[PDB]
Amino acid sequence: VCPKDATRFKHLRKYTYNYEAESSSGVPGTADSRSATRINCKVELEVPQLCSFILKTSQCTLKEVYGFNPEGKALLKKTKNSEEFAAAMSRYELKLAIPEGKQVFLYPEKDEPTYILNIKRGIISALLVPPETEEAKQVLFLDTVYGNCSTHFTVKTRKGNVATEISTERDLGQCDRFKPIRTGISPLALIKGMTRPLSTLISSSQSCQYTLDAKRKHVAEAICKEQHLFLPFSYKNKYGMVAQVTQTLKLEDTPKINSRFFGEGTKKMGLAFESTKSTSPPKQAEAVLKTLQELKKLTISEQNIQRANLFNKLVTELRGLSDEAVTSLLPQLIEVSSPITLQALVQCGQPQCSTHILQWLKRVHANPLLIDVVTYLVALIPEPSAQQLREIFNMARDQRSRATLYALSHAVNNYHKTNPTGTQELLDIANYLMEQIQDDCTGDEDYTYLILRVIGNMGQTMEQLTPELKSSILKCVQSTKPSLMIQKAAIQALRKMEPKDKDQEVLLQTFLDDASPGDKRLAAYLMLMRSPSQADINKIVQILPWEQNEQVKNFVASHIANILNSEELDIQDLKKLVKEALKESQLPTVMDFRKFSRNYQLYKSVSLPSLDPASAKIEGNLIFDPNNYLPKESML
């Protein structure tokens, strides 16, 4: 919706605007000695129709002061990235529409970078001119790169009912985004909550000066100047620190365009800012190395005057850098010095530094006990990161220890909940475990036992991603090669795999198998009773009177008798199936508990007021061959 009061242009017009701006950070007390940068671009505003605009940028030259003339004139040079800079800009064109003149919805093409988008948004906010009004006091609510705004609108010069000179001004301490954007900090610095006080010590206010065409409403020129001042470091409270943003847009020409079509990039976005990283060029890392070398040199030089300073500038650059580059570089840094790298890491509140500690630990050749200790310690930290998982996988491969694998499984579950996406890490570890087990599960009994049970820790994820591993688990369960210990571990790996129709079928096959071991048969029977079916229970009850291993028969019959004894709500449903299976069979009479396996169970149901009944279920498992004076096995 395009109100005519918002018209600041004419349709069928391309307005080519030269963008020229500079940011100059300097001290006025020393002749404004400043770090200044000069941006110059060619801009191509395109207006096939009202409020349906297309933006083509080009000829973007990025120059910055490398020196000052004696009279104070700077010396600007194009930077190394100024070419990739211009390429990045020119290689996109923007399509946008502003319903009502105060509702901005960007539609970029091919997901333009966040920072490029934000620079574009600032340019648009400079471009956006409010709808015309005859009220000089006009102040209203406006969006900007910086969020919402209470912006004042006073017409300086008006011809007829059309304003020719206008000033747009807003104090920057009132617009939505004055909240200090968080940043990584020394996680060990104890000072907190002092950020707001400083904002009081901050001064800033914006003013834009506009020259408008009364005929076609177009902006002849635009001057937007911003000045930020800081109060401390100032005698008399006026010798502080000054900053200024000065950007200008000059209308070189307004070619008329024969166009009536406007595009809308798939990605729909507003004028507001979207979070971004303190990114730095990959090169600078090498400077980090020069710096670390320098410090190592200086301790030999015996000078410590500025070492902490350089450390700070470094960790600053550090926070400018990225993750993968750091880790790739990482080994060299330790090669230089371990303890200093530690000072950096500990003072480094960035997540990657925490993740990279693991890598350090393997570098220093830590003792396995401490490796596993820290492994579990971190593994319980919420919201695991895919990277962190890759490190955990690498460490598990390297040590292949019990604690490492348990921590890996728990972190796997945590991230699985964190990210339902079956990322390539899950596939890689799944393949590695499949290698560690194969179909025969032949291997070191401790090793394969641990592999099986740790896999069970993530059973559901394995189901989701790899059915072939489940098939191999069933193979091993039905395989005679693995020891009964390994077979049982495979059975319990189904903990998180919730046996399905086929899993129940395989369990029934291996259980009703008369030659199957008594302990193995009981384990399969227990896992089958986790969620049994009436047809299954009927078959087992039919086979019960003819089962071998009298101790097995006593155990199973005692279990059934207890199930009938149980009243628990779920066991109420289970007893329906039990009854359905008891019509045409009678149980062996359950004798002996000191020399025959026996089943006992107790439930503790309490009626909590205003809450569902709480039932505590107790299972007493006794395993006795007729030759055991004491239980061969027993689980609490």
Added chain:
Amino acid sequence: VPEARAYLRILGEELGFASLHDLQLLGKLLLMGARTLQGIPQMIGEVIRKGSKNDFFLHYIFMENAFELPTGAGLQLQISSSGVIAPGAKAGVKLEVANMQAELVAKPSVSVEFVTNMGIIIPDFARSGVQMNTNFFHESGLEAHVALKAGKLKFIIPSPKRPVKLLSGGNTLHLVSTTKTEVIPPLIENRQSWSVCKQVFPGLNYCTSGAYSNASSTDSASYYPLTGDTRLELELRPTG
């Protein structure tokens, strides 16, 4: 011979397992602890025999509040400032065994510095900022050298080859570019540099000095302690 193992599950989550083989492994771990222990004394003596330098330098940020705020152009004005401590000390004694020549270093140092920084940044692209930097340093210690030779003993104390700054009150600014960190040269007008030195010894003098620009009468410039690289220092100057 019975084989047994046990494990603990919480919510069904196994919490590690214990094995008899695990007990045997722990036995070998104790044996390996003994094996590592046996050779330690000779190793630790070996470094004294050859000598080395020992450095113990913490660098801790007690105070730091960093953040950033956007800008109208869409760029990001970094803002942050910290107080930091680097309280370490240089050490490490080298012994020339059978030469009876002992070299000893012990000079703890204090680096009480502070920075504030503001920076307009272009992520992955560029930066522009200024760094407000107050400085306080100290060091003290001994450089000693003792040698026994042919029944002739001599304790040697190398003299300072540079001024010994007991105190160092320094303040500086810098203009920092993506590829560079540049100091801001001091004004020469009313550039007050002075020094007063008293004799602790004929070759060593206790020195008090101050170098600063007195621009208080000039507008836009903070008073004499500020607006420029200002140093108030307390030193022992070796005459050479």
